[PDB]
Amino acid sequence: GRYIGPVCRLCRREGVKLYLKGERCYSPKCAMERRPYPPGQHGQKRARRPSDYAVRLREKQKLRRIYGISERQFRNLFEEASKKKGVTGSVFLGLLESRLDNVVYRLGFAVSRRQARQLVRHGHITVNGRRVDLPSYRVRPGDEIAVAEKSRNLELIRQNLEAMKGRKVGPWLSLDVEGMKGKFLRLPDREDLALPVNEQLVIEFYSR
Amino acid sequence: PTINQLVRKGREKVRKKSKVPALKGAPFRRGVCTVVRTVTPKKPNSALRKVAKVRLTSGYEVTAYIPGEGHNLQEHSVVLIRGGRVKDLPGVRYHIVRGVYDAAGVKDRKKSRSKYGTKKPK
Amino acid sequence: RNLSALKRHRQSLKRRLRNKAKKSAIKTLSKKAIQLAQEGKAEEALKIMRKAESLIDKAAKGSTLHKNAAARRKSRLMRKVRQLLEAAGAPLIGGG
Amino acid sequence: MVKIRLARFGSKHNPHYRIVVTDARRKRDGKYIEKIGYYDPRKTTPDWLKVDVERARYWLSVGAQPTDTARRLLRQAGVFRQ
Amino acid sequence: PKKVLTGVVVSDKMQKTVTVLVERQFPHPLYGKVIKRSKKYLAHDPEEKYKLGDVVEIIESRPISKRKRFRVLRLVESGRMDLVEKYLIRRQNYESLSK
Amino acid sequence: LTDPIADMLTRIRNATRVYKESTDVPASRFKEEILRILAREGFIKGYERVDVDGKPYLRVYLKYGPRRQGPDPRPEQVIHHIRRISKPGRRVYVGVKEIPRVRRGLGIAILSTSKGVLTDREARKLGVGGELICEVW
RNA sequence: CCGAGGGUAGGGCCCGUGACUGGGGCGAAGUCGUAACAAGGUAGCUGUACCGGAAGGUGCGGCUGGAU
RNA sequence: GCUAAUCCCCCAUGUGGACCCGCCCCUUGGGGUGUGUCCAAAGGGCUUUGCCCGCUUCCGGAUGGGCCCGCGUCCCAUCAGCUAGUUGGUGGGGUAAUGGCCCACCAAGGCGACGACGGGUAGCCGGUCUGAGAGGAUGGCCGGCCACAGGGGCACUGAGACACGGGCCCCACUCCUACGGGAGGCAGCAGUUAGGAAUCUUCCGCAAUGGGCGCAAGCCUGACGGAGCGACGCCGCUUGGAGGAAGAAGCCCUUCGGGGUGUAAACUCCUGAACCCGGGACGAAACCCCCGACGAGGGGACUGACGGUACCGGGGUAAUAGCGCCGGCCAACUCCGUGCCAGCAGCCGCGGUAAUACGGAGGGCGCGAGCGUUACCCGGAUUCACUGGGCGUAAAGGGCGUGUAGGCGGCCUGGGGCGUCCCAUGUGAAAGACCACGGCUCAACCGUGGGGGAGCGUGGGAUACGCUCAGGCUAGACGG
Numbered sequence A: 001g002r003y004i005g006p007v008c009r010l011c012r013r014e015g016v017k018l019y020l021k022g023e024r025c026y027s028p029k030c031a032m033e034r035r036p037y038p039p040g041q042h043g044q045k046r047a048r049r050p051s052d053y054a055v056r057l058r059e060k061q062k063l064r065r066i067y068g069i070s071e072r073q074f075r076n077l078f079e080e081a082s083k084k085k086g087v088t089g090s091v092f093l094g095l096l097e098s099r100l101d102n103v104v105y106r107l108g109f110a111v112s113r114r115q116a117r118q119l120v121r122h123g124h125i126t127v128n129g130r131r132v133d134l135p136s137y138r139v140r141p142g143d144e145i146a147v148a149e150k151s152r153n154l155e156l157i158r159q160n161l162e163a164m165k166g167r168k169v170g171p172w173l174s175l176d177v178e179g180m181k182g183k184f185l186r187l188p189d190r191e192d193l194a195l196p197v198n199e200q201l202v203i204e205f206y207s208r
Numbered sequence B: 001p002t003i004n005q006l007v008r009k010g011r012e013k014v015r016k017k018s019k020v021p022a023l024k025g026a027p028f029r030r031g032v033c034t035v036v037r038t039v040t041p042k043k044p045n046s047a048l049r050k051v052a053k054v055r056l057t058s059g060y061e062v063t064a065y066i067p068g069e070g071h072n073l074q075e076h077s078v079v080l081i082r083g084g085r086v087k088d089l090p091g092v093r094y095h096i097v098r099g100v101y102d103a104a105g106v107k108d109r110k111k112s113r114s115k116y117g118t119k120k121p122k
Numbered sequence C: 001r002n003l004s005a006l007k008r009h010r011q012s013l014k015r016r017l018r019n020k021a022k023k024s025a026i027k028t029l030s031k032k033a034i035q036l037a038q039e040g041k042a043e044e045a046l047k048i049m050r051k052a053e054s055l056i057d058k059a060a061k062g063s064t065l066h067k068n069a070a071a072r073r074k075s076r077l078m079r080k081v082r083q084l085l086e087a088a089g090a091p092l093i094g095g096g
Numbered sequence D: 001m002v003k004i005r006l007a008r009f010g011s012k013h014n015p016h017y018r019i020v021v022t023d024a025r026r027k028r029d030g031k032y033i034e035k036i037g038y039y040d041p042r043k044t045t046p047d048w049l050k051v052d053v054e055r056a057r058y059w060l061s062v063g064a065q066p067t068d069t070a071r072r073l074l075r076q077a078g079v080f081r082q
Numbered sequence E: 001p002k003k004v005l006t007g008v009v010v011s012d013k014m015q016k017t018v019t020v021l022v023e024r025q026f027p028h029p030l031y032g033k034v035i036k037r038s039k040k041y042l043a044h045d046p047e048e049k050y051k052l053g054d055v056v057e058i059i060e061s062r063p064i065s066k067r068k069r070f071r072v073l074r075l076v077e078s079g080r081m082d083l084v085e086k087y088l089i090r091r092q093n094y095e096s097l098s099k
Numbered sequence F: 001l002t003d004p005i006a007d008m009l010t011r012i013r014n015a016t017r018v019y020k021e022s023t024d025v026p027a028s029r030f031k032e033e034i035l036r037i038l039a040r041e042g043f044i045k046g047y048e049r050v051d052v053d054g055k056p057y058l059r060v061y062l063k064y065g066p067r068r069q070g071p072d073p074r075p076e077q078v079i080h081h082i083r084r085i086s087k088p089g090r091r092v093y094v095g096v097k098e099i100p101r102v103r104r105g106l107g108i109a110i111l112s113t114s115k116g117v118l119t120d121r122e123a124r125k126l127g128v129g130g131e132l133i134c135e136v137w
Numbered sequence G: 001c002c003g004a005g006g007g008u009a010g011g012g013c014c015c016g017u018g019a020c021u022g023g024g025g026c027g028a029a030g031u032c033g034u035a036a037c038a039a040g041g042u043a044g045c046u047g048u049a050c051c052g053g054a055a056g057g058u059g060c061g062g063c064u065g066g067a068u
Numbered sequence H: 001g002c003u004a005a006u007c008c009c010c011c012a013u014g015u016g017g018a019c020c021c022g023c024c025c026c027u028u029g030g031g032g033u034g035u036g037u038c039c040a041a042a043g044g045g046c047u048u049u050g051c052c053c054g055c056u057u058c059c060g061g062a063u064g065g066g067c068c069c070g071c072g073u074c075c076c077a078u079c080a081g082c083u084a085g086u087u088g089g090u091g092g093g094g095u096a097a098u099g100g101c102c103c104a105c106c107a108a109g110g111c112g113a114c115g116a117c118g119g120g121u122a123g124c125c126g127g128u129c130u131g132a133g134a135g136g137a138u139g140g141c142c143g144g145c146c147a148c149a150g151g152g153g154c155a156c157u158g159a160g161a162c163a164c165g166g167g168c169c170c171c172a173c174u175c176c177u178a179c180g181g182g183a184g185g186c187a188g189c190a191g192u193u194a195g196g197a198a199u200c201u202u203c204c205g206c207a208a209u210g211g212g213c214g215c216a217a218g219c220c221u222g223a224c225g226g227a228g229c230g231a232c233g234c235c236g237c238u239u240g241g242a243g244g245a246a247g248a249a250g251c252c253c254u255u256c257g258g259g260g261u262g263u264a265a266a267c268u269c270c271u272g273a274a275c276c277c278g279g280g281a282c283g284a285a286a287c288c289c290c291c292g293a294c295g296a297g298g299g300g301a302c303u304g305a306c307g308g309u310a311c312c313g314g315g316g317u318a319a320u321a322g323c324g325c326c327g328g329c330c331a332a333c334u335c336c337g338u339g340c341c342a343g344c345a346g347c348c349g350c351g352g353u354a355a356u357a358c359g360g361a362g363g364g365c366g367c368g369a370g371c372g373u374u375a376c377c378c379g380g381a382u383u384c385a386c387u388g389g390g391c392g393u394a395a396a397g398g399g400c401g402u403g404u405a406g407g408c409g410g411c412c413u414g415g416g417g418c419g420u421c422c423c424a425u426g427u428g429a430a431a432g433a434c435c436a437c438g439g440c441u442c443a444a445c446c447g448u449g450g451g452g453g454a455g456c457g458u459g460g461g462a463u464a465c466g467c468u469c470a471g472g473c474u475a476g477a478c479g480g
Ligand code: SF4
Pocket: A007, A008, A009, A011, A012, A017, A018, A019, A020, A021, A022, A024, A025, A026, A029, A030, A031, A032, A033
């Protein structure tokens, strides 16, 4: 399945802060705050010029590792976006963001997507009433993404939902806290989200 | 050529010559070792490369490479072969697959074990 | 190791007999009239030729002759006889 | 003879028929003469049955023969209503 | 409809049969240039009224013989010995093309 | 002389390239029509039916751009590019739907249609195809 | 009568194989000389012919893709 | 040797059809009519002077076909000439029907550089894979057509077969036998063996769908619907989530100060794959029965292989990770061992005592129930170049004329309208493909709707260009 391993080393390699844990990501116990250099024996040696290929690989891995998604599903989504009408970059990011485990995280149901996945998977989430335990479900405009009322009395979701009381949620989303439910308003612009990612470089990678 | 010349003679699509004739359409071919020896490579290399002469089910008799450090192959050794030449060994167009039939895997191999037919160590 | 295919085979040999029987009889009387007509002998030709036509259409009741084969056979018979009697004449009866 | 019946389409444990006019001697899912409606025995959708009633009556008139459970479905579309 | 073809009578050495050469043009499927191809049809001439060099129309017809599937329909032009000669000159050139 | 049309296009190409005022091509009705289009689209100043030593010709008046600065002061051509498409060796015909767009519209395709010699724009308006004579830009 | 095929005889094509034999490719750690690349120590190359352990030579005619 | 019938036969009846000849219409043998001649039949069952199932002749419909035709359909010209039923005719035979399909005679024809004949390879298509497109490759699975049923020939029965599980014969092979004689045909479903690198259960059910027979009940159905095995392929899912030290041990590197694996572990909380118990389908309403009329219509029941499965509810355990690679192409570097050895290698190249290239280790990169390898197809390959290449010296101008076929062709006018262009129209099956919506929790998969196209048939139109026919011209060419 998913990467399921050490996650700080990912940000370290990627040279940027990816927020893959939630809480510690903002603490001084964050690794990017302590050691902002690539993992392993050679982290502190001086980098030589990355090749063009090198550059585009990394930009793609960044985007990937953000969502904890397989290269397979990633590539499929990309391939969908390329043949899909309009502009590939936006559509790709849009489709990425429409993943259930992702929406569950963007709505603050969880601190990380990893946790969001386990939430979705363990059926603690529903879509328009119906239970959906598939992280890959494509949420469409007008969908109600709620906590399972049979799971609403869960510590973790509470502490997380407590943290969301008036906390802003992207323009494309709306959260009704206390009711433990949210809605998907429309598919997000590249503009409407500020990923540390030039998604053109991803296009260029898959055109090789 | 003129357009008329093309109408008359056309363009010629040239077929590719297989580098693995003894395989006769197949990914692999089983065979039996007749000669198992060492062979010295050409310039600028120097070695005693391990090689078996194999008699295939495809009716061919060819020389195949025995990759890896050490082997247990001898006369009458049953053996599976695959394509792939050894550039420095003229006439050697195939590789014996380690870990098939009478070909042992490489002893104490640790890296790249699937290519050398070695099971995962405890 | 057995079937009603056996039954079907038995039946075919009995239907076989009857088809040949009728077909032979038709062939006999056909050429017969034609022979008479040749040396015609008009009344005798037509008399036999009337009998051939009957056996023909009668064959086409069942599986022996297809209607078109019957039609074809009658046509050639009558065509042959008339053309033969035309060397001498005269047609003493019908038809036609 | 020429018949009006159900050619199975769809997939495993997801039966979806096209009610169809074809020669009886055809294979069940073979080339058919004309499609005159569909049928979804599981009612997974609002309209799980459609029948061009106009065309169906023609085939009936010209000598076609419905299967039993086709005639059932053909009844539900009121082809036999006088 | 029955196919109707125009061509020259290049042989009448047969009883009640003439040989009609027919030509057609078309663009080469790949190289685009327009090219000529011809074909000889055996034509039914029940009156034996068709002479060498006649431009005629033949129409697709029920089989008359093995290879005869066309009747001559009508005369179009006459005395085209100039065409007949191009057919014959080529056949004549073939002895030069052996070994 | 196997292709009068290609000879004319070539007579022009050779002349413009060394910046002649005009050039003479042997005259024909079909050539006039092509020049008619060439002028009305501004590739040439125009033409006139003249006579050379007793023979009907077409004098084609060439047009260029302004003198340029720098090492090479020769002016940009107005006709950068002109070449035959359909040729005696291979006739090229398109239907109205196959009519090309020369240089994204910055250029023209000349075609002979059963409504006469037209540009690709014109042919598309009238909705007819024809033989693709040449392309200019 | 025709007729699967069988039999007799004689041809044609293709494949595998054969004492032995011809040259070829690769190998290279050998023997002989050094033909070509410099005017390569006889300018070279060339078709042909004759000749020599070998590279090659010479004749006849040709080319310059020959140094001075 | 007996005996029935929807078995066979004869006679009648002739609505009508069949055939000969004449006539009209037509125009290949299409329809109509006149004399003659010829041909019909079967009964069964109920609730019984009425029904239902059948039977008979004839027209038609619909469906499914046969035959024929134009065009398209691979490699070798180191295959260049092929042909006696051969090509045509007349007459017969044969068929449902045209035809040398078959026969008899008459004539001497038929085909070929636009590739006959011969050799090799191949079932063809819808499609499929690739590709910017053009094109290339391929035709298994599904659909359509063809061909075959151990090898070969043959006809019989029949609406239809020259018939996979029908007949006859010959051959090869195998088996049974009581040794006299007999039997067989998995390229149906499973299964065995052999061959191979390699390819499945001697499973369940007719519940659905479909087929045969039956008035109906119903019977049959290895079609089919399903279950089994195989990471074979694609799709979905798990092996946990949060917190957690300037950071344990172990291992690796170290200039000995330290760096690394690494929030990684431990540890804490939280969730709860698996499993446990409880419920439990959709796929199935028709045939039928009853009222109506055996119809229209209305009510009535019977029935699930998969399956106690999916799925719903209750509980509930932190719960498999591996494979390739890290010289350049190409993303990932260090220590040791080795010392042109052992070995690596797709190409270039690595290895001779400080090897980022061999072997291990630490570390890193890339994918993840997969990862790599071999094989093959298209791509990159404008490296067969139509789109889209070349030939002084790189591979490439024929030693040179002459000329056959063919390809190509000057200026003006008109006819025709062949190419070519335009419009209308028929055809372009379904599946697949593309856009949209929808159904299985998503996806894969599947359903529903939408838009085309070339190509060819037909009808009408256009005439510049190319073609053709006709008439002029002199600028090319030839002649004086
Ligand atoms: S902590 Fe810093 S490093 Fe570790 S995941 Fe959150 S952001 Fe990346």
